[PDB]
Design a protein around this nucleic acid. Structure first.
Ligand code: NA
Length: 291
DNA sequence: ATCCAGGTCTACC
DNA sequence: GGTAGACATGGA
């Protein structure tokens, strides 16, 4: 557990003595799309049909708009607070080549996000830029999500499966998924009619989970790894996108090695900590725009 | 401009 | 089971 205790306030909860927890590292490392940095350094996000604001002050984290019951049943796990990241970093740091990346993203934690939202979010991520991905996800939410109110503004929850099933390919194109619109529609249809079951897929071991996810149109090896890592906690995942590819070619492999070979290399070397190693590498590579 | 961005699908061998 | 071209969008 990377925290001591919690104090329930009137309109917030204070998590005391949190370790390995930095807002920029967590919300900007590439894993999430609905968290927005505020002028004061706080971040406001929309997840699980709730609007939450997070502030870090010294060794404490203040989570606004939630109570103690919600922290225990939803948010403590959302921020993966029961895992000791000190041990993860210690193990990974034994590899000198990973040290600089780990040091750069010491406050990273892998959030435990919703499978349905993550599935669609990363289908949208294919050959796309994060700012555009965020816009598309927010548009989809504004178009059919439930209204949430927080500090004078109305936010929109991610749509339910039933509401998203009402989308036509054109609707997705309007939220602008581009050519990915057909993939989103086909995928929502398969979820709606029960062809593929996310709860069942999430219960499968890492390799089997990966294989089932690729059955979805628009989901390949990279998107499947992102989905199982970010919403199913399958930590042997090693999503190789353009940035992780660059990071690996700088440290472990030659420039002509295929993405499949890079994925296999990483999973063999990092094992059960592959997903974590991947995040530190991605964050360092993208933030420092390595060439 | 050509390329790139959290790649995948298709066609092909 | 391993590789070229197509596929939208917008920033640089
Ligand atoms: Na697929």
């Amino acid at each position: 557990m990377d925290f001591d205790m919690i104090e329930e306030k009137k309109d917030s909860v204070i998590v005391r003595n949190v370790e390995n927890f930095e807002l920029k590292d967590i919300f900007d490392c590439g894993q999430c799309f609905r968290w927005h940095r505020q002028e004061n350094g706080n971040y406001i996000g929309i997840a699980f049909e709730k609007v939450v604001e997070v502030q870090k002050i010294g060794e404490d984290v203040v989570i606004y708009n939630i109570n103690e019951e919600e922290f225990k049943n939803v948010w403590s796990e959302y921020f993966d607070l029961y895992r000791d990241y000190g041990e993860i970093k210690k193990e990974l740091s034994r590899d000198p080549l990973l040290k600089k990346s780990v040091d750069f993203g010491e406050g990273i934690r892998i959030l435990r996000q919703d499978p349905f939202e993550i599935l669609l979010s990363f289908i949208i991520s294919a050959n796309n830029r994060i700012p555009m991905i965020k816009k598309c996800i927010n548009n989809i939410s504004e178009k059919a999500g439930k209204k949430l109110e927080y500090k004078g503004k109305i936010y929109y929850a991610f749509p339910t499966v039933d509401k998203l099933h009402e989308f036509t390919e054109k609707d997705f194109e309007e939220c602008t998924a581009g050519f990915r619109a057909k993939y989103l529609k086909d995928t929502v249809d398969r979820i709606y009619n029960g062809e593929l079951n996310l709860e069942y897929i999430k219960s499968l071991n890492d390799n089997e989970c990966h294989e089932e996810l690729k059955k979805f149109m628009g989901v390949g090896p990279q998107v499947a790894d992102c989905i199982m890592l970010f919403s199913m906690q399958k930590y042997s995942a090693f999503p190789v996108d353009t940035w992780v590819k660059k990071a690996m070619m700088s440290l472990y492999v030659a420039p002509d090695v295929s993405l499949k070979k890079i994925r296999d290399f990483g999973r063999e070397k990092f094992g059960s900590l592959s997903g974590f190693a991947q995040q530190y590498l991605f964050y360092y590579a993208r933030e420092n725009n390595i060439q």
